[PDB]
């Protein structure tokens, strides 16, 4: 009687779809599709989706629907030895919400600054740029200098970020009041849209996750008809069969699909924890996976048609203009691609709003997962008033992101995106998968799926849950632990101490699970094997 149920069946579907879509399929997926094998990227993408995303998604959805709990205390009914996975998920999601909200802050500042008949980043002639100006081409009579930069580039690095004022990661300079007020407004929006629960989430997703689709569609309509759109699609579909021989393309496709579906994060548990008792979760997982894949595909088309248009109006070979990886692709390149076209105001506004809501829905999903997990873990003093402990986590995440709002926050947000996410979430996901697959009993899980839906899955899903997906996850994490990356951003390299701190942050979340099994022994005295046999099998419901 302490749980709840969604308003309808489409509400949970749209909420999980909004959780499955983010800026990933907007910018990271197409750049990967071009760099990592060209048009020949789709086949390994589909392979890794069938073998790495759908199994995890189906398993987590079914377990969350049956057990009706979060991701912290849900192991009391499954396998209580890995309860630290819950707290690891909480702190991981704290890191994620602290670094992600800065992107929405950038987007909403772009929105609030894009209300003018002449966009402030179209011409370099403002009171902040330097003598290194270089207007959009419009001609072939100019010689671009290495030190010369596009007007939108210097706008993004000198007005919305003030990044040149940062003399290195050792110092920070100062917080920007503009971005501070912007992220404060976005945090108030998140709270006032997440206060009640899934009853309000299912109503706000109707406009939160559906509005991006119409914006993407009108952008595709605008792009696919301009002179030069064909080169974009040709480059997006031109295969390169030699690339699939290297393991790099395969592991990058695996990482892309795993981050696009995002399982093992502890939010599918909370979402399915409100679904009906015997809803068609198999259909739900399949539909969500295909919708996420199709969204990534159509977003790749949308970005690459305008990239090809820009490459025909400017010099060709989008590979050169698509130099850097990150939000700079949208905030600099696509920014100019939109600004140089007629009706630039409305198009920039709708694009910025689409990015804003594609951030907000994912933030909603993550915070829902966190609050539901903690409420299921601590229902004694909490769970009576849900409006409390939500302001707590919102203020904590805001004061954590405060360190990113500084003038040199791009480096730290890219660091948090690169190291705090991948390894921690991958180890957590693989550990919970081998727990619910090797310790809880895959035969018990199949019998449970039978009891819920009405027919047990075939041997294919069985071997995918037992053999394919664990090997897949460990292969990803081992490939990531094979080549230590030395990344950079905006002509600035990352020092070695920055790499050590990134390793520490990316490991301060995996060291969270052993302290639970350590504290399990002090409070409960006795032999080790007794606690092992008590924590390998679940207790009474």
């Amino acid at each position, epitope marked *: 009687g302490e749980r709840e149920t969604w308003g309808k069946k489409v509400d949970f579907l749209l909420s999980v779809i909004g959780y499955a879509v983010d800026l990933g399929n907007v910018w990271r997926f197409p750049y990967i599709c071009y760099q990592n094998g060209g048009g020949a990227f789709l086949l390994p993408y589909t392979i890794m989706a069938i073998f790495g995303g759908i199994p995890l998604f189906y398993m987590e959805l079914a377990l969350g629907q049956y057990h009706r709990n979060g991701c912290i205390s849900i192991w009391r009914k499954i396998c209580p030895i890995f309860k630290g996975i819950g707290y690891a998920i909480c702190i991981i999601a704290f890191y994620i919400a602290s670094y992600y909200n800065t992107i929405m802050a950038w987007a909403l500042y772009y929105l609030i600054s894009s209300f003018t008949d002449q966009l402030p980043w179209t011409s370099c002639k403002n009171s902040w740029n330097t003598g290194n100006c270089t207007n959009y081409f419009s001609e*072939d009579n100019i*010689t*671009w*200098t*290495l030190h010369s930069t596009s007007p939108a580039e210097e706008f993004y690095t000198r007005h919305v970020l003030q990044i040149h004022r940062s003399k290195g990661l050792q110092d920070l300079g100062g917080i920007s009041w503009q971005l501070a007020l912007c992220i404060m407004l976005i945090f108030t929006v998140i709270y006032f849209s997440i206060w009640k629960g899934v009853k309000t989430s299912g109503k706000v997703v109707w406009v939160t996750a559906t509005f991006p689709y119409i914006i993407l569609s009108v952008l595709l309509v605008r792009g696919a008809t301009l002179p030069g759109a064909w080169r974009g699609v040709l480059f997006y579909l031109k295969p390169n069969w030699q690339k699939l021989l290297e393991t790099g393309v395969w592991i990058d496709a695996a990482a892309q699909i795993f981050f696009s579906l995002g399982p093992g994060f502890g939010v599918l548990l909370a979402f399915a924890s409100y679904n009906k008792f015997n809803n068609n979760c198999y259909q739900d997982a399949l539909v969500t996976s295909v919708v996420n894949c199709m969204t990534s595909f159509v977003s790749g088309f949308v970005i690459f048609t305008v990239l090809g248009y820009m490459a025909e109006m400017r010099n*060709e070979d989008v*590979s050169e203009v698509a130099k850097d990886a990150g939000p700079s692709l949208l905030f600099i390149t696509y920014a100019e691609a939109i600004a140089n076209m007629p009706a630039s105001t409305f198009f920039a506004i709708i694009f910025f709003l689409m990015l804003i809501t594609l951030g907000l829905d994912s933030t909603f999903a993550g915070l829902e997962g966190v609050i539901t997990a903690v409420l299921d873990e601590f229902p004694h003093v909490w769970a009576k008033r849900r409006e409390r402990f939500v302001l707590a986590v919102v203020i904590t995440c805001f004061f954590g992101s405060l360190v990113t709002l500084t003038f040199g926050g791009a480096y730290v947000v890219k660091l948090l995106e690169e190291y705090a996410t991948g390894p921690a979430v991958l180890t957590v996901a693989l550990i919970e998968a081998v727990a619910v697959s090797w310790f809880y009993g895959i035969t018990q899980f199949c019998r449970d799926v039978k009891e819920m839906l009405g027919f047990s899955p075939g041997w294919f899903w069985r071997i995918c849950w037992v053999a394919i997906s664990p090997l897949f996850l460990l292969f990803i994490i081992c490939s990531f632990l094979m080549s230590p990356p030395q990344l950079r951003l905006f*002509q600035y390299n990352y020092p070695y101490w920055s790499i050590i701190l990134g390793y520490c942050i990316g490991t301060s979340s995996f060291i969270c699970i052993p302290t639970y099994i350590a504290y399990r022994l002090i409070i409960t005295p006795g032999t080790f094997k007794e606690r092992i046999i008590k924590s390998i099998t679940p207790e009474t419901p």
Partner: antibody
Amino acid sequence: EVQLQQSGPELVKPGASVKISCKASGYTFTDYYMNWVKQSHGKSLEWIGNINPNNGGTSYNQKFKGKATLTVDKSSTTAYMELRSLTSEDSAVYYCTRSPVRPYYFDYWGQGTTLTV
Amino acid sequence: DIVMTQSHKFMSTSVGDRVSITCKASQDVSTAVAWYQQKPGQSPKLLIYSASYRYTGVPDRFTGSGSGTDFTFTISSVQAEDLAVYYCQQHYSIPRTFGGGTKLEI
């Protein structure tokens, strides 16, 4: 007014290594790229690689992965090219050209590296 | 990679008449084509970039036209010093590649 100096002729035993020089004078050396071209005995031109003075980057050709290692000496406005693992046919005339970022033409060239084997 | 073929090395047009030479491109390019000269023995020099924009410092004798796949390098009535070799360059893709070039006889 904008002259670029290089090395001269050198007949070297096959298997050894030669370090080519490229002087910059007339235009700001730290503002444009520094590429190299491979041309055989009265044959076509072929691009070799790319050099950036700010960070010493190198976007080498896939057909010259190890045939030439490229470094830059911004103090003397010079950029070397470590030519290791040389054979007889790789004894071709080269050039040091300036090039701005993405018009990709070669304004001023050198005097030709008459490398004999 | 990118291959820019054209006529042979011997086939050319003598002095006084119009001399038009093309250079076949593998893929399609918008305007990223450039031509060069090189006297036998000396260093190659730039002529025209973007296939129509002559670099600052060349006489009006030089002309550039053609786009897409067919690129016309039209010259006419060369002087006693315009005789040289002419390769076709592009700016499409790494690695950039030149062409075969053509003589100028007589």
